[PDB]
Amino acid sequence: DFANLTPCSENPAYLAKSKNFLNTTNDPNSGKIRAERYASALCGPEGYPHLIVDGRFTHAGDFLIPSILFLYIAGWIGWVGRSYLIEIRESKNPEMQEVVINVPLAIKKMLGGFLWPLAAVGEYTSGKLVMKDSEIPTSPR
Amino acid sequence: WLTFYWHWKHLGVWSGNVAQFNENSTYLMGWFRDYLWANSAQLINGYNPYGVNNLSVWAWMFLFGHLVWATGF
Amino acid sequence: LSIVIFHFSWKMQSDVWGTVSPDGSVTHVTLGNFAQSAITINGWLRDFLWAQAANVINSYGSALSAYGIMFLAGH
Amino acid sequence: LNRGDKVRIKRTESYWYGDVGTVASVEKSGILYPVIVRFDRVNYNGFSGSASGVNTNNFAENELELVQ
Amino acid sequence: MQTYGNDTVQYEWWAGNARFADQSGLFIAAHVAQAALTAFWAGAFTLFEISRFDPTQAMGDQGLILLPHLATLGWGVGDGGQIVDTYPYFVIGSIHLIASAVLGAGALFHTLRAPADLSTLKGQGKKFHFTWENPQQLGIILGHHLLFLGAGALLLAGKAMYWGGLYDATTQTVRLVSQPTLDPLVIYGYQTHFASISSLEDLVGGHIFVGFLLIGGGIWHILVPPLGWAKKVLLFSGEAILSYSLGGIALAGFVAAYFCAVNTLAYPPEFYGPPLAIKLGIFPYFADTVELPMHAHTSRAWLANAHFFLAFFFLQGHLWHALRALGFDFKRVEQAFDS
Amino acid sequence: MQTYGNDTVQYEWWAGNARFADQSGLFIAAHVAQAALTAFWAGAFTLFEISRFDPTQAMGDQGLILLPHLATLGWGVGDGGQIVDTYPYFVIGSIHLIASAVLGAGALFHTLRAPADLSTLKGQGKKFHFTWENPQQLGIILGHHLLFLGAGALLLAGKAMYWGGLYDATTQTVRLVSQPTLDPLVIYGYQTHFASISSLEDLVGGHIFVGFLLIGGGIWHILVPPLGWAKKVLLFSGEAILSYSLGGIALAGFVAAYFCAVNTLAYPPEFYGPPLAIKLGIFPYFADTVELPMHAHTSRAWLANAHFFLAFFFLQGHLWHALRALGFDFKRVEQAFDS
Amino acid sequence: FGHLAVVFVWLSGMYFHGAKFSNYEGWLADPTHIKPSAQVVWPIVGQGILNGDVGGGFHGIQITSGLFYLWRASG
Amino acid sequence: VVVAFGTPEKQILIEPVFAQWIQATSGKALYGFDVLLSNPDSIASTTGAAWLPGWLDAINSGTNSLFLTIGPG
Amino acid sequence: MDGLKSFLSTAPVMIMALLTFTAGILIEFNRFYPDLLFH
Ligand code: CLA
Ligand code: CLA
Ligand code: CLA
Ligand code: CLA
Ligand SMILES: CC1=C(/C=C/C(C)=C/C=C/C(C)=C/C=C/C=C(C)/C=C/C=C(C)/C=C/C2=C(C)CCCC2(C)C)C(C)(C)CCC1
């Protein structure tokens, strides 16, 4: 319920501080736009937006929409980095392709990473994502 | 980290100024200024050119601990 | 070199730098505390390090806040 | 095992235990470790600051599992 | 089902529904369970939102979609466009939910007890065994389904004329219609202004004209097989007939999304809300005219903006299967970008 | 395309559109999908600019580039540049967007149901098969496209004379051009002051003369093949015909960027904004007279500056494809700096 | 020679920032009231607060390299 | 950085909802979660354990350090 | 020129090319759309 978190539209600490919001960019109304945007959040006793991350879809834009947007991009960086590393491993000189990146091969993989979650599920089902424990270098216990 | 947290939260609770911890602990300058620099004021004045008080041994120990910690380096 | 520039920073502010009264009198930045506090590690801790870094830790929300950032950055 | 045969190192003390290697030569002279195995990953070997290790080690028949 | 020549396509778990496309008995079992799940949603979510219904507020602003559908038919509505009876919504929400249990049983019957292929069965199940490359069998299936869609449209015309009465959004009451239109010219004139008809006596007469057309169309498809010109120009594969269905129901989705947002007759404003302005941004979306705050989207902005995306992603689903039916391997995209 | 004597050149994925050159069936499929994409942008951004338009401020100051094209043509304007209609804007933005889907269907037809080469099949498709080395077939394609562009220019001729009339910015009304200027002397005189055209009758009369020239030249290219002198001076290769078109569309792009900035008749000031001043810093840009606030520009200042930069890089793409047609390898630039 | 090219680019950057992004003309009128400043930051993510009032209406990073004092001694 | 840049409202302040919920399950009704012991109608509080009037008075007084109020810091 | 393409495709240059392009995205997104604490 967050009884100790008043909304920022009815928070007197935020209302006395939103009129003195500074401009972060060259726009002279940057502090006014931030005052209207942060009014919909939940504020504490010091009039700053406290974010709720527990899983409520009312506060889905606090963490879940950052979570969905991050994991897509971070999955994209990991998947095209993994797929480039697999492709250059089959070449004559796999070592030199890491310090001297085959840039046309890199752009080909990086634009193909928009369908990484469908490619990750399919490669997990095919067994080419996860290696078996018998086929991996192992410490001597 | 945890004893800095315990001490600074309880310093607000014991003085009644819980908002000093609540508005400053979220960034590390608030820990550095409102906890480390602010609360060390009477500690480092345990002895001064103008005399001593009961925090003189704790002032000497606090610098003694700095010496032993840096000698370990 | 850190002691050299700390000796420089304290001796200038305590015994050289400051404002001038119109009749010729000079008051200093740290009011001449080098003669009685720079003989002791505690005075170096209190009257140099603790006292003169009040300007770098209260600089947040101002033009010198990048120095407040970079002071924590070097820590 | 012939030259060019792919083996997996079952010798536990080695760097390549669980890694695949390629048989370079087998000595027919009664050697205790007659099988020279070449690897694509060098080991830790060398002085501190060296950019590469050694990719070759001699093994016996009991320490190799057939892969290819 | 498109196999690309390979007779032994195994299919993974994500494409696991493609495994029974050549199996007639399992084709019934998944589709009957779909109708079990469809009638369960018509039953449970009628009973879900009749518990959430507040009779003092308008049901459009509450965010309810199934009670305005039954209220437009003329159940539970008094003389002022309000809701006074919670019982006919409870009966219809119970009748759909019990019929979902009969369908949910018959799907488990066709999964377990009935054979996977109906060619094995002897009796009437051998006549029900359909193959995808048999056009004469598929028109019998199509003609019988056109009979029930024609009977459904005549039942709605029957419900308005005799078995009760429809709602009149102009006079704000439940009105029993009498003697709808019989001239074919006004229905032919309704191709232009289809979304602004504003007349019960032409809505029912249009439903009479399409009810007689679908039943007569189902007579023709049962009695007469495909002639041969349709076999030349249309494909008769498993994914090809699904492609025509996904394309056909995407066009029906786009019409129903547009008809929900601008028409006031079949979607009265005291049951649903104000007629939506056709906005467009990075996607087309029908926005609220009155713009009720706190993310309200008053129950016509949920019907129209879901039946556009579900029509768009069936238009994408029609394009996925028609490309598969025509012979595109879809792995040739990956070899186009290969070195 | 150009092979440089290497016969079978294997293009990579970034140059992947050079693969379907010298393949007549896939040449249709990419261009029809380009026409599908172009009619989609005409359709969607007309409806996108309807949803953003408010009649308080002018259309040029808002950032609307498709509605003033239809307002100049004489549809959504009541009196004195006031937009009180907006339904013929929705009709045109829906006719174009439906025609995109028809073109989008036909693009996937030539992808799948038609082969990559049109010489494989027989019966009204081998006549549509074209090779880049054949001047007879390329002039048949050119003559029919000139007939379409000639009838398009004559479509504006019938539009102003009969079908509603063009908007007149001088009188701030919409008038039907009853008496166009059918004089070849005054049209030939407009090769100097084409920028300062102010007469609607001279604008339509110039469209009649080019609408009959393209139709008359369209009949000429269909009946008569390219002659012996045109073969000797113009290369009939795959990339040469593209480079002629890229130079031709860059010259039209510069002329249309110049007609946008300085004209008041074909670009009225109340629809697009005030006429531009042709500035030049490190590139020629057309700047507004008065400064629109919040770092915004008029829609005339967005059409003219984008079409200059489009026609500049389409002149650079004309230079890229002319040198490849003429025989410059473009690896010799690497081989000059390496040497 | 390559190292001197690095220093000359660095030297040229100090004179270019003094020429284009500085209050050196403003400081030369009032050396006792205007603070030296030769770095102006772009307004982004709140970092425009570092452009403090160094006097004369100019806003920028208050420089401590002494370049303004060097250039006045150079004429 | 955002406090240094004069914009402390741009801080990412995450309420520790999961730990505030556990304080509510022991009886602290400060955060408004009506769960278990902060809910007087739940079976954990209906059962009439003899600790409950003593415990709920101590957990809601705020003068002790029993279950301190916790925030983004 | 071919070895200049190889030097421009080296690991220091391409990570400085990417992080400049990544910072080019993030600064420009926070210039036209600043102050986004949440969605
Ligand atoms: C505060 C920290 C500290 C201290 C106390 C020491 C101490 C020492 N350093 Mg240093 N050092 C430090 C940190 C420190 N270092 C770190 C961080 C590094 C790592 C990089 C080094 C690395 C290092 C090197 C590489 C070198 C030194 C050397 C030395 C010696 C300096 C000369 C000397 O004897 O001075 C006199 C001693 C002192 C100033 C220490 C304090 C003594 C106090 C004032 C007296 C206390 C005695 C007490 C009263 C009697 C005992 C009490 C009894 C009850 C037990 C001394 C032993 C140099 C050396 O050995 O030169 C000969 C040397 O070459 N240091
Ligand atoms: C009437 C609907 C219809 C029918 C009967 C089929 C039938 C089938 N399709 Mg599908 N298809 C359609 C519509 C249709 N599709 C649409 C909607 C799309 C566009 C997205 C496609 C695109 C598509 C692809 C891309 C593939 C097929 C394939 C398949 C086969 C197996 C699929 C499977 O096992 O799913 C199993 C089901 C799942 C794995 C669940 C996936 C859940 C998704 C990710 C989320 C969807 C729900 C989401 C939460 C939104 C819900 C909104 C709602 C609350 C309002 C089967 C022949 C496959 C094929 O070619 O096999 C031969 C194949 O690869 N289809
Ligand atoms: C509307 C929902 C729906 C419906 C009614 C069906 C119906 C069918 N699917 Mg199915 N499925 C669905 C959703 C659905 N699917 C989705 C969401 C997934 C992706 C996770 C799949 C993936 C899937 C697989 C992997 C396979 C099926 C198969 C089948 C058949 C299993 C029963 C059978 O024939 O017994 C006889 C069946 C067997 C002798 C072997 C199959 C064994 C079990 C019963 C498969 C059950 C899997 C189950 C449906 C997955 C649940 C997904 C979801 C509902 C939670 C049945 C006709 C199977 C099939 O056609 O094989 C012939 C098949 O192997 N399904
Ligand atoms: C009518 C237009 C036309 C036609 C049909 C062609 C056709 C072709 N050209 Mg192209 N060319 C043209 C215009 C045209 N060109 C123009 C305008 C340029 C100047 C930039 C060039 C310069 C050019 C070069 C430099 C090359 C070709 C080549 C190619 C071939 C393959 C292209 C490919 O697969 O790239 C697919 C497309 C991409 C991989 C995308 C490239 C990424 C750029 C940066 C995208 C541009 C983004 C831009 C900002 C978009 C916003 C525009 C606006 C809204 C702001 C093909 C025969 C290639 C060749 O030599 O033939 C084999 C080749 O190397 N052309
Ligand atoms: C085939 C198959 C499948 C599917 C299935 C499904 C999914 C279906 C569903 C089904 C269903 C889903 C059914 C239905 C049922 C229902 C129910 C079970 C309900 C219950 C309830 C009742 C019966 C009652 C109620 C009531 C009323 C009416 C009145 C009031 C009171 C009460 C509330 C009591 C799967 C995939 C699994 C697998 C494979 C095979």
Side-chain angles (χ1 to χ4, degrees), chain A, chain B, chain C, chain D, chain E residues 1-293 295-339, chain F residues 1-121 123-200 202-339, chain G, chain H, chain I:
Chain A
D1 192 26
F2 318 117
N4 51 328
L5 294 180
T6 64
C8 310
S9 88
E10 306 293 319
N11 191 270
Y14 178 81
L15 283 159
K17 285 156 104 145
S18 44
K19 303 189 287 290
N20 313 129
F21 276 177
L22 309 185
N23 308 319
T24 47
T25 52
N26 219 13
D27 203 299
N29 290 348
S30 285
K32 183 63 70 71
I33 292 167
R34 195 192 327 124
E36 312 277 342
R37 184 169 299 106
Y38 289 6
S40 297
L42 267 70
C43 279
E46 280 300 316
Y48 302 144
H50 292 192
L51 302 194
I52 304 297
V53 297
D54 49 11
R56 303 183 200 271
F57 294 96
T58 312
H59 316 95
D62 285 9
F63 188 69
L64 176 66
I65 312 187
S67 301
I68 289 173
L69 191 53
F70 178 76
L71 287 181
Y72 187 59
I73 303 176
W76 192 330
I77 303 155
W79 196 252
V80 308
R82 177 181 180 272
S83 71
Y84 181 79
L85 198 58
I86 289 174
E87 193 81 48
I88 68 172
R89 206 182 276 125
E90 301 183 342
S91 192
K92 167 186 178 295
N93 212 347
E95 311 289 328
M96 267 302 185
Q97 295 219 77
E98 318 196 356
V99 294
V100 185
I101 296 89
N102 199 9
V103 174
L105 174 60
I107 299 162
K108 160 182 158 281
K109 289 296 179 68
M110 281 161 61
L111 275 296
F114 80 110
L115 285 196
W116 81 262
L118 300 172
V121 165
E123 188 156 351
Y124 178 74
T125 318
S126 176
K128 305 200 65 176
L129 176 64
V130 176
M131 291 311 115
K132 309 153 58 191
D133 286 332
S134 87
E135 304 173 359
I136 294 167
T138 311
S139 297
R141 301 275 103 81
Chain B
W1 285 349
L2 66 94
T3 52
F4 276 17
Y5 170 42
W6 194 98
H7 186 211
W8 197 20
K9 189 169 187 75
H10 275 259
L11 276 173
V13 168
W14 297 328
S15 313
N17 194 9
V18 286
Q20 201 76 21
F21 180 80
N22 289 15
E23 83 179 0
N24 301 310
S25 45
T26 78
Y27 60 99
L28 300 165
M29 185 49 98
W31 294 82
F32 186 77
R33 162 191 84 248
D34 306 293
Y35 173 61
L36 290 189
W37 176 93
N39 293 286
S40 60
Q42 284 181 94
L43 159 68
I44 62 176
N45 277 285
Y47 55 93
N48 45 9
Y50 321 110
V52 288
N53 47 69
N54 72 312
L55 303 184
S56 183
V57 60
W58 302 112
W60 194 92
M61 182 179 296
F62 175 79
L63 275 194
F64 173 88
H66 278 84
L67 186 53
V68 179
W69 180 86
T71 317
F73 275 46
Chain C
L1 287 179
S2 291
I3 302 310
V4 165
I5 62 175
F6 280 4
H7 170 220
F8 180 76
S9 185
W10 203 356
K11 189 73 193 199
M12 292 304 107
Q13 293 168 211
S14 48
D15 288 308
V16 176
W17 296 341
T19 49
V20 191
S21 158
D23 57 355
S25 185
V26 168
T27 186
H28 297 109
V29 166
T30 79
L31 296 160
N33 54 350
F34 202 88
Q36 301 95 10
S37 302
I39 60 171
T40 300
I41 311 285
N42 198 31
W44 278 98
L45 182 74
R46 166 194 53 238
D47 297 306
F48 181 75
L49 292 175
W50 181 94
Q52 301 173 23
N55 309 89
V56 74
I57 66 170
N58 302 335
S59 64
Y60 268 30
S62 83
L64 307 189
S65 58
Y67 303 117
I69 280 158
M70 285 321 282
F71 183 82
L72 288 181
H75 272 87
Chain D
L1 303 177
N2 215 36
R3 157 176 191 89
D5 181 68
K6 284 184 169 180
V7 289
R8 175 170 279 106
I9 302 314
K10 314 300 294 176
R11 167 193 281 181
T12 55
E13 69 188 5
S14 191
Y15 173 83
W16 298 279
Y17 171 73
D19 213 1
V20 291
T22 307
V23 175
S25 171
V26 170
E27 314 160 311
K28 312 300 202 295
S29 293
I31 317 294
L32 288 163
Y33 305 101
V35 185
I36 311 158
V37 182
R38 197 260 303 159
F39 305 94
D40 46 351
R41 276 161 294 281
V42 301
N43 55 353
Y44 294 131
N45 204 288
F47 209 75
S48 183
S50 295
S52 175
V54 59
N55 64 323
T56 43
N57 196 43
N58 289 34
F59 294 91
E61 294 287 328
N62 61 83
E63 289 146 301
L64 309 189
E65 185 65 86
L66 194 57
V67 173
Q68 63 103 30
Chain E
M1 177 52 63
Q2 170 79 229
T3 56
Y4 302 112
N6 183 30
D7 204 62
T8 61
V9 181
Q10 283 317 111
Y11 285 120
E12 306 299 319
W13 73 264
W14 33 272
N17 285 329
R19 299 173 173 166
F20 62 89
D22 292 4
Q23 320 201 23
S24 310
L26 308 188
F27 197 81
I28 292 171
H31 284 50
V32 161
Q34 172 56 64
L37 281 169
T38 302
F40 187 70
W41 191 89
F45 267 84
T46 309
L47 299 195
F48 178 78
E49 75 187 57
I50 199 62
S51 74
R52 286 203 174 187
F53 175 57
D54 186 31
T56 314
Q57 277 192 353
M59 69 223 88
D61 298 354
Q62 290 165 55
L64 323 173
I65 50 175
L66 304 187
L67 311 172
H69 281 113
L70 313 161
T72 319
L73 268 295
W75 281 291
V77 184
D79 283 330
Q82 64 199 51
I83 303 304
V84 291
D85 278 338
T86 177
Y87 189 56
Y89 309 138
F90 173 75
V91 170
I92 287 158
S94 294
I95 281 178
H96 281 72
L97 194 145
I98 300 310
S100 164
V102 178
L103 285 158
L108 277 174
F109 163 71
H110 274 110
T111 287
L112 281 75
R113 185 177 285 170
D117 301 335
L118 289 184
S119 55
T120 314
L121 201 153
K122 181 62 80 71
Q124 278 299 99
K126 58 175 180 64
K127 279 202 201 75
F128 270 61
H129 169 65
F130 81 108
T131 71
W132 289 112
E133 299 96 352
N134 204 9
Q136 196 269 333
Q137 179 75 28
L138 297 160
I140 285 176
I141 301 155
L142 176 57
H144 285 89
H145 294 178
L146 285 165
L147 274 191
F148 276 170
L149 277 187
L154 288 190
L155 185 57
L156 160 75
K159 195 266 181 182
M161 285 150 80
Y162 322 117
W163 285 276
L166 262 180
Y167 188 81
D168 197 0
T170 74
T171 62
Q172 277 206 336
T173 193
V174 178
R175 160 157 77 86
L176 190 146
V177 70
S178 313
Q179 206 181 190
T181 177
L182 274 299
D183 209 28
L185 272 298
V186 288
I187 295 92
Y188 198 85
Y190 279 150
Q191 311 180 217
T192 49
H193 47 276
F194 72 102
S196 59
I197 175 168
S198 77
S199 194
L200 281 72
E201 55 266 359
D202 303 333
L203 181 135
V204 179
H207 275 111
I208 282 288
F209 262 65
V210 74
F212 270 20
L213 195 81
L214 284 187
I215 282 185
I219 282 174
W220 198 89
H221 268 290
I222 283 164
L223 294 177
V224 189
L227 312 175
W229 72 270
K231 291 163 61 181
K232 186 153 57 175
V233 72
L234 296 154
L235 272 73
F236 276 73
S237 179
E239 265 175 346
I241 299 159
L242 180 52
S243 310
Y244 312 142
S245 311
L246 286 173
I249 210 173
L251 179 59
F254 282 135
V255 166
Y258 177 58
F259 197 85
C260 181
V262 68
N263 191 274
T264 81
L265 185 82
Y267 298 87
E270 86 290 328
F271 291 158
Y272 292 85
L276 302 168
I278 299 93
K279 291 312 190 185
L280 191 153
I282 62 170
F283 56 87
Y285 73 111
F286 313 83
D288 286 284
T289 300
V290 75
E291 204 263 326
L292 201 64
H295 204 255
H297 301 315
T298 55
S299 88
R300 176 198 292 255
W302 276 107
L303 287 173
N305 305 332
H307 296 332
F308 174 90
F309 280 76
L310 281 171
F312 170 84
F313 282 107
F314 287 175
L315 203 60
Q316 298 331 291
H318 158 70
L319 286 169
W320 173 264
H321 282 120
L323 262 56
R324 278 195 51 105
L326 286 181
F328 195 60
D329 202 16
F330 272 119
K331 305 168 179 172
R332 305 197 318 163
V333 174
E334 307 177 18
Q335 287 101 27
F337 287 92
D338 280 352
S339 307
Chain F
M1 277 292 298
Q2 171 73 235
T3 50
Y4 300 112
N6 215 26
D7 206 4
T8 73
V9 188
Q10 313 283 356
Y11 301 98
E12 295 90 4
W13 62 270
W14 57 86
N17 302 307
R19 296 171 173 167
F20 68 90
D22 279 312
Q23 291 180 357
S24 167
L26 296 184
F27 200 81
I28 295 173
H31 289 56
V32 163
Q34 181 50 68
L37 268 176
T38 312
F40 187 72
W41 189 89
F45 267 78
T46 312
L47 304 190
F48 170 73
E49 280 162 30
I50 280 157
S51 69
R52 190 164 284 180
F53 168 67
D54 44 348
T56 81
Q57 37 179 344
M59 286 196 296
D61 296 332
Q62 272 147 359
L64 269 47
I65 54 173
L66 292 196
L67 300 185
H69 275 102
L70 306 170
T72 317
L73 183 62
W75 283 345
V77 298
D79 270 319
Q82 188 60 41
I83 311 295
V84 288
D85 212 358
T86 315
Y87 173 71
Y89 298 158
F90 209 92
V91 171
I92 289 306
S94 291
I95 282 173
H96 278 86
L97 193 145
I98 288 306
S100 169
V102 176
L103 284 160
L108 289 154
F109 180 81
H110 282 96
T111 292
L112 301 174
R113 281 183 56 88
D117 266 323
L118 292 195
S119 46
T120 71
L121 62 90
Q124 293 297 110
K126 50 182 185 318
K127 315 179 62 183
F128 277 79
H129 170 69
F130 82 108
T131 56
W132 290 115
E133 57 96 23
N134 212 27
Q136 162 71 263
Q137 191 70 27
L138 292 178
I140 281 172
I141 304 154
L142 179 54
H144 291 84
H145 293 184
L146 284 163
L147 269 178
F148 265 74
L149 276 180
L154 289 199
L155 200 71
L156 187 148
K159 165 75 180 67
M161 286 159 83
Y162 325 116
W163 276 285
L166 279 171
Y167 187 84
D168 197 22
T170 75
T171 57
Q172 301 279 304
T173 59
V174 169
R175 46 180 283 252
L176 282 73
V177 181
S178 160
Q179 191 159 338
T181 78
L182 312 165
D183 178 55
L185 275 300
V186 73
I187 288 174
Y188 193 79
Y190 287 167
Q191 71 195 1
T192 62
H193 49 278
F194 59 96
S196 299
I197 177 67
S198 297
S199 181
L200 266 193
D202 276 284
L203 170 70
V204 173
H207 267 281
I208 280 175
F209 266 56
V210 67
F212 277 139
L213 196 80
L214 298 188
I215 280 180
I219 297 156
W220 159 261
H221 279 94
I222 284 165
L223 294 177
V224 183
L227 311 175
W229 67 271
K231 288 174 183 69
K232 280 153 209 168
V233 74
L234 291 170
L235 281 74
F236 280 75
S237 78
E239 203 168 6
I241 307 303
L242 178 55
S243 64
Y244 306 149
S245 304
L246 283 196
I249 210 173
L251 171 65
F254 286 135
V255 160
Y258 182 47
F259 270 100
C260 182
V262 309
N263 214 358
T264 56
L265 172 77
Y267 294 87
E270 66 262 37
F271 299 148
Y272 295 90
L276 301 166
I278 311 179
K279 299 295 193 75
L280 188 153
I282 77 171
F283 48 80
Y285 66 94
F286 313 94
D288 299 283
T289 49
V290 294
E291 210 159 357
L292 195 68
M294 297 184 284
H295 206 72
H297 308 270
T298 59
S299 89
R300 182 192 300 258
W302 271 106
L303 275 175
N305 305 358
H307 282 105
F308 177 81
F309 268 105
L310 275 171
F312 173 71
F313 282 119
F314 267 70
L315 205 50
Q316 296 335 288
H318 158 69
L319 290 167
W320 177 265
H321 286 318
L323 296 205
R324 290 189 41 102
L326 288 200
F328 191 67
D329 197 22
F330 275 113
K331 309 184 185 306
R332 294 159 50 181
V333 186
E334 174 171 36
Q335 289 150 12
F337 289 153
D338 195 17
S339 180
Chain G
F1 276 117
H3 175 268
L4 286 175
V6 168
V7 182
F8 273 126
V9 166
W10 168 81
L11 262 175
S12 160
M14 298 318 116
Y15 283 92
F16 189 91
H17 280 66
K20 311 304 278 200
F21 317 104
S22 84
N23 55 351
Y24 178 70
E25 300 151 305
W27 170 81
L28 208 65
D30 269 335
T32 60
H33 305 128
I34 311 295
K35 303 294 210 196
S37 167
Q39 186 182 348
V40 188
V41 311
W42 287 324
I44 190 65
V45 302
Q47 92 183 14
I49 201 178
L50 303 182
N51 293 325
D53 194 23
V54 289
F58 192 78
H59 306 293
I61 300 305
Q62 191 166 343
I63 54 163
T64 61
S65 46
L67 285 174
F68 279 21
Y69 314 127
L70 164 64
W71 299 334
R72 194 196 190 274
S74 306
Chain H
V1 166
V2 302
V3 167
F5 285 171
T7 44
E9 71 275 350
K10 294 211 294 178
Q11 271 180 125
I12 301 175
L13 314 163
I14 305 299
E15 278 285 342
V17 177
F18 300 159
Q20 283 168 353
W21 185 82
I22 283 186
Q23 296 199 359
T25 61
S26 285
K28 191 162 165 83
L30 193 143
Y31 318 109
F33 309 123
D34 280 338
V35 55
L36 288 166
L37 293 189
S38 61
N39 181 28
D41 294 333
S42 84
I43 47 180
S45 178
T46 305
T47 184
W51 66 75
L52 286 173
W55 173 259
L56 268 70
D57 187 75
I59 208 175
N60 299 309
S61 58
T63 65
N64 47 4
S65 297
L66 178 55
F67 273 94
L68 303 155
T69 308
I70 45 176
Chain I
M1 195 90 197
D2 185 281
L4 186 57
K5 295 191 301 170
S6 290
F7 160 78
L8 286 167
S9 80
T10 51
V13 176
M14 291 310 287
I15 197 169
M16 291 306 138
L18 188 148
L19 291 189
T20 304
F21 164 86
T22 315
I25 286 180
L26 285 164
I27 291 182
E28 284 297 351
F29 180 79
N30 297 293
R31 177 160 77 88
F32 300 112
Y33 303 114
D35 296 332
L36 304 189
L37 179 62
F38 47 78
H39 187 273

